[PDB]
Amino acid sequence: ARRRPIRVLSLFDGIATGYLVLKELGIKVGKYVASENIKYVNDVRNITKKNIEEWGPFDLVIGGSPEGTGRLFFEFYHLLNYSRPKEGDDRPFFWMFENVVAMKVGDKRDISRFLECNPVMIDAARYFWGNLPGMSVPVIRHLFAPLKDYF
Amino acid sequence: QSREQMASDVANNKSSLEDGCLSCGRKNPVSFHPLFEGGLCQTCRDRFLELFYMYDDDGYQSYCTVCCEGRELLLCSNTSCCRCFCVECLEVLVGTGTAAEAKLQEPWSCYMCLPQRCHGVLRRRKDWNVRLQAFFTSDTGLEYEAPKLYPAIPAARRRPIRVLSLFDGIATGYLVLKELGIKVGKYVASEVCEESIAVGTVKHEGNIKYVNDVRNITKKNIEEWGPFDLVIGGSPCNDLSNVNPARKGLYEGTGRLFFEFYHLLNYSRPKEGDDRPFFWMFENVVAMKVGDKRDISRFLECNPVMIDAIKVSAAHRARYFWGNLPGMNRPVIASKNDKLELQDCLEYNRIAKLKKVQTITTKSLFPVVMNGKEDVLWCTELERIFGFPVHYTDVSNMGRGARQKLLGRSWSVPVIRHLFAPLKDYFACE
Amino acid sequence: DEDQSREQMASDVANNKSSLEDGCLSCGRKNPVSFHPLFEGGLCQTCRDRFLELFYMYDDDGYQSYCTVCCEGRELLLCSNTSCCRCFCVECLEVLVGTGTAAEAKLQEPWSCYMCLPQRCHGVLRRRKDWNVRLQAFFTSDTGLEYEAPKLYPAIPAARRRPIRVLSLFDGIATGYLVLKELGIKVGKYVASEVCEESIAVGTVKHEGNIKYVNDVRNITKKNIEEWGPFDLVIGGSPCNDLSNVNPARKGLYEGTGRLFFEFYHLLNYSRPKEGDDRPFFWMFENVVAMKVGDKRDISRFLECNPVMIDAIKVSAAHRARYFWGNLPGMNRPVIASKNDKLELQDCLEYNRIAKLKKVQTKQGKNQLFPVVMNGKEDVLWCTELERIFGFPVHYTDVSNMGRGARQKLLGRSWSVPVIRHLFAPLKDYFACE
Ligand SMILES: Nc1ncnc2c1ncn2[C@@H]1O[C@H](CSCC[C@H](N)C(=O)O)[C@@H](O)[C@H]1O
Ligand SMILES: Nc1ncnc2c1ncn2[C@@H]1O[C@H](CSCC[C@H](N)C(=O)O)[C@@H](O)[C@H]1O
Ligand SMILES: [Zn+2]
Ligand SMILES: [Zn+2]
């Protein structure tokens, strides 16, 4: 109990649907930093370590790619390492990635190896990831429905 | 805003060339030529950052020395000079009528082969030799912090350097370490080529623990192989280099293996609260695109240095050397035992037609004549140029096809010996 | 008595009605002019004249091309054991041992030759207890005429010695020069007649051009020798390409490369001195053992010498026997291995490499592909190992940026350092040393 509100470092807002579903979920946000209420920061190429140190911490990361996938994914990973908690910390942490199943198999092997986590698949299908307790807007609502347990 | 009126304006003894783009014409410049006096626009200096160190298959410079472009290029035929000029560049600056002058003047001498003055407006710099290297080393992207100075660990407490290596090749890193005298208490490798393992095993008495491919090393392997004290690494320089029209960038192709150096760099680097030294190293070809010189140094969070082998060897080798080695930005001093000239590496009763050999690719003019007969270089002479011991690749029945390809993607021994010199302040030598 | 089947003689020796030395061991004919060097028996005129030629013939995969007894290729049966390659044919096995044994022997897997097996009277094929010492003498004496023993030159005074003015006709890769330099004999001049441009590079870069070259041998006249003379030693060796019986379209002497023998003879006649002399003079020659006996007779008649036979396997780790003519002091001493001889294949390999055989013979798949095994994958010999096998100092042929085939071909047709060292050892007694 006694849970502070959420702060999500989203990415690839696009239509900014994720914020809409999060608001409809019945929980409030503390600070949202999006990049294509939403406090825009920069382009994807202009975020430094001291920036995340100053505005940290964070509790959510979002992927998304409906072209070179590595261009976006490796910056995503870069940040993901930036936002992840250091040693001696017990703060809850989340992450999540979205990618179409129509993709290279070697690509898939590489991303699975780099994220050090086995992937999951949800039919429409879209390749899915994420260290989150739980097992297309309806898909978004279904996925972040159980987010209210620890918040 | 053509260069025609710009040259006339500065010819009136009332204006300078640094207010405009010498190779581009437009005003609003950012920086200057390191070869002459003037300035360039922002989008026009980027192309000079890449193409300066290119060379053609004919042993001569690839593109223009003024504008770095040309449909046709007049070529200088002096002694070991490769600069090729542009057709329209000459008449804009030095004066009109030079098209038919150099055509009939055989041999032609370019403006860096003769004592030059303000011929037209071609004011060659008095000390362009020293200011050219600063055009490639000291740029300003984000001004990262100075390298952390690990405390100088004295003797009687230094462990043998537990080296790690990715894409080892022919154990170039191991060879230099034994030359310095640093005891290699453990040396993992990451080579996959069949012939490369043969060279590193028989020559080194089986002291190298060749293990496996890079894409199979998992998180658990490092803690059962470590702790490590250095992480060497050299990426495959064929993904995005300005020689293959494929143009497979860092984010698409075998350039993906750069992050695999960064990936394994995170596991090996010490956890928070520990106070032990941990050095690392990286290098790639200088002739890469614009959007990679800083991205690789952004993820690494460091400032690249540049070292050229022409000051310590008889070949043209200059690459970007990342890392935080102790005292790495110091100037490139030559060695007394260096084979500074080609004639110190040739066989008996052979003489050369050049002084410094230009770059060599998968396909090897002819730089040697013996007994008054025209010949080419031998595979046992390339080893002396790169500082390797003689009869080093004579293993596993390779002729000239493999002893040349395998030697064309290795590091210069006296160049690497420069960086690793201060490592004796942290590890037990001899 | 002569043209009958082998059954009569087999029964006669079975019924104690005759002796082993009465009939030919390979055809049954009478008149034992010689003795079989491996068993008890006799040879006729038309049998031993094809046993001096085809005994040292080997196949392309390291085996014997003809059976050990009849030397006729009708049907073969190979000794499966390694370190031995001698094989017996069908008729040579069935008649002289026992009927019905061929099928059982073929079904007997693995099979062993009777020489590998312990000696017993398996039929009438009794094995001589001193076969080797008699086989060695089978190839050197009892043939041809009895030429007068060469006269030894008088003992040269120790002080009055001069550097040797060699003329190494058909030098190759300066094998004789390498032996002389290693032996410790002062060379004051060294001529050479080679037309192999790659070999010129090897002889030039390695020995600092100390040897004065000459172009093709076919363009040398008397005046050249008059200018270059005197000559304290003449050396030569014919290219054993067309002389050997390996090629079906063999020409032998008097044709092709055989004619070069006449060039060597003329060059030796020109360079040898005149009457009323005291200058020491020595010469030498070499050709393969496997050649026609008639050509060997003509060569031995022209030169007036009885050739000796030296087999490299007694000091080296290879199969190589070749004839030696010449005049040197003591060409038929018993050979002894040196204290630094690489006698077995194990001493001529790389690191992390293991040798399975012990002495290598001179379709390259699954049979010759397995001389050396590394990490469970058997492979072939390297050039750096051939250089060690042949006795040359290591890293010798690696010039002119040539790879595997050129190096091995250039290495396969040369001499061996220990054999020529043994031959040239007594030469320190006439010329200046060190
Ligand atoms: N996936 C992979 N795993 C291990 N090695 C690889 C590899 N992909 C390429 N390599 C090898 O890595 C080498 C990089 S070239 C670098 C040579 C070496 N680092 C030196 O400077 O001496 C290439 O020759 C290639 O054969
Ligand atoms: N027509 C010719 N004239 C002169 N030399 C010849 C020749 N044909 C072949 N040769 C040389 O004769 C040599 C035969 S190899 C035999 C030479 C010596 N036993 C050694 O190898 O050390 C070859 O090296 C070849 O270069
Ligand atoms: Zn410009
Ligand atoms: Zn130009």
Ligand SMILES: [Zn+2]
């Ligand atoms: Zn020039």
Ligand SMILES: [Zn+2]
């Ligand atoms: Zn007979």
Ligand SMILES: [Zn+2]
């Ligand atoms: Zn037979």
Ligand SMILES: [Zn+2]
């Ligand atoms: Zn046998």
